[PDB]
Amino acid sequence: VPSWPQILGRLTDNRDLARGQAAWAMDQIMTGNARPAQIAAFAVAMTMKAPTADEVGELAGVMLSHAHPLPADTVPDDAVDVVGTGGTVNLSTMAAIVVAAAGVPVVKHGNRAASSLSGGADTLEALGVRIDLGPDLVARSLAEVGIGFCFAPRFHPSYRHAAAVRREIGVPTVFNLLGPLTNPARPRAGLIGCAFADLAEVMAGVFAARRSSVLVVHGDDGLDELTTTTTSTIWRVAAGSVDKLTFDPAGFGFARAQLDQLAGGDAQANAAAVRAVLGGARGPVRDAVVLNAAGAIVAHAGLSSRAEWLPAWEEGLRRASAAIDTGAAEQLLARWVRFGRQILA
Amino acid sequence: VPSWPQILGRLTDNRDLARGQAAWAMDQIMTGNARPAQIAAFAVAMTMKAPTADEVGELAGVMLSHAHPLPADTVPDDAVDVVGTGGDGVNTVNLSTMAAIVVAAAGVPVVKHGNRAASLSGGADTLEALGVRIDLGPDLVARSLAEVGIGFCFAPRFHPSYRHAAAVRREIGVPTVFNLLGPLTNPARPRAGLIGCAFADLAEVMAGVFAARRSSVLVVHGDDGLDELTTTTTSTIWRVAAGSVDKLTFDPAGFGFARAQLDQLAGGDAQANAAAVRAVLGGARGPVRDAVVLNAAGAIVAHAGLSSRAEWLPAWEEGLRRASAAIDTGAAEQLLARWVRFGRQI
Ligand SMILES: Nc1cc(F)ccc1C(=O)O
Ligand SMILES: Nc1cc(F)ccc1C(=O)O
């Protein structure tokens, strides 16, 4: 019979949990039954033990079970997520728009900045996108615009107890991996960036168990996106298995960049950077958008077949660049904004 | 400057804290400034990183700075503590309580410190089940020391500011670095002690805290995992005196103790513990008496370390004879009765 003493005792002893123990803990957390101290002890102990893919799957699966779903048959079978976890202008917001403009449906998931968890909501808001929508309007956005956004607090109202604890302790934990694994629209493909290099192998194992087509990505400079500044580690998930690879953007003709050139600031500065890139401005920010958009496209392609790596990337990069240069990406953002403004009437 | 995100991130990254960071955390906890979540995160992260003696000394020192002291000059200079930190999920409060009575009856002043656990993890509960008055203010514990030669500091009484940490420790149950603080925060500050620890790594850490204090202490760990000197096999002892530590392997067979089974050395609930106390102090022979005598003798040795003529082995020979005589001549039994009387008479 599961208890906090028993579960925490096992973690502090540096032991993997028994099956079901992670799930039980998550259910206590999601039901308002776990005290802030119990939530905090578990979050910290799980992090220092080092979670396994099976334990993270239990946490995500229980949390998903408490989430509002999107209506049935409203998510295309081949939707993708584009996101980074924890850890500079929001490349993932721009790449998502570019990917959708290339004809791949995108469903994002997040909160406002520095909260649980993955976000990007502030930037979208700064652009005039209505972020706060229920499942029916997300599904409609997805069908009519090609992109949608799931606002975490709206879709995961039962995570409020954990969210409040994460704020009190303000240190990164296992709970930081949950955003990409609990997207309410359950896309089967994704480009997933992870700051914490070690946990990215674990995240990938969960996507493998799900039979997802995902590139989990780690900038060897510490970024949670694919980088132009140096190389990257990629976990390529498809057909139930992971294989780690080194990724070098110079091998496609990208110039090495400086971290000072991807810098960000308030929501408005970053909205200006989005508008610049979508309007065709060239530079290392664009380079970085195209690259991450290509990865997501390559992930998406992995749903249908196994195409070979370098030609998949060659096509993804071209599709991303063309989504920008035809004006399709700018025009998609404009349709997204128009869609949100039509809801009022 | 310090914050929870900074201290917690350092611990979860498996780094030792910077000097003063443990102290800051502890003071936030003791002033009611820490949220339950922050308290629990820190307790757990400190445990999983593996606390050093410097970190633990900071925690204990801050906690002591908030404790009620006993009145000036009421604690004999040579008072001793006898206590364990607890097992998983067993304990030896039976042995500690009995050894403390026996040591006091041998003529060594004893000042214990503790709390009620609730079932099988106390303690003050055993003493309470013996008719001892556990809940006494500093002035009465002092009188208890003077008139009976023993006393008990009830933790919720002497450490009222620890209440926020105690509530969290309760909420989460799991043993943490906080479980090491009992022996190190006895409000009477005895300079000598026999201190048991279930875990050899943490025992060394505790030895290093006591070494910074110039205590004369034996930190003890049975090599079967008992938080006391065991009779089932060897024990490791960290002998602490004059600011240094002498780690050694101890074998009671060398003093003619028969090997016991782990099945034999209790303890259990308040009541089981009380009956065991009655029997042993009445002269009942067997594994329990042996463990009690062995542990009271170690406390006597640590005491001898204060005014230190005796060498190790003759000190052990003397402690063993004094402990056995305290029981056999009925002095232990009489002292317990006297202690009960003192509590009724106030
Ligand atoms: N309810 C939530 C769900 C999330 F995923 C993140 C944050 C909250 C919140 O209550 O702030
Ligand atoms: N205030 C306390 C001090 C201790 F050492 C142990 C428990 C409490 C409490 O408030 O329950």
From Swiss-Prot, chain A:
Pfam families: Glycos_trans_3N, Glycos_transf_3. The keyword Manganese does not apply. Mg(2+) 1 binds at S92, E225. It catalyses: N-(5-phospho-beta-D-ribosyl)anthranilate + diphosphate = 5-phospho-alpha-D-ribose 1-diphosphate + anthranilate. It comes from the Bacteria. This is Anthranilate phosphoribosyltransferase. Keywords: Amino-acid biosynthesis, Aromatic amino acid biosynthesis, Glycosyltransferase, Magnesium, Metal-binding, Transferase, Tryptophan biosynthesis. One of its GO terms (cellular component) is cytosol. Mg(2+) 2 binds at D224, E225. Binds 2 magnesium ions per monomer. 5-phospho-alpha-D-ribose 1-diphosphate binds at residues 84, 88, 90-93, 108-116, 120. Catalyzes the transfer of the phosphoribosyl group of 5-phosphorylribose-1-pyrophosphate (PRPP) to anthranilate to yield N-(5'-phosphoribosyl)-anthranilate (PRA). Anthranilate 2 binds at R166. It comes from Mycobacterium tuberculosis (strain CDC 1551 / Oshkosh). It is an enzyme of class 2 (transferase). The gene is trpD.
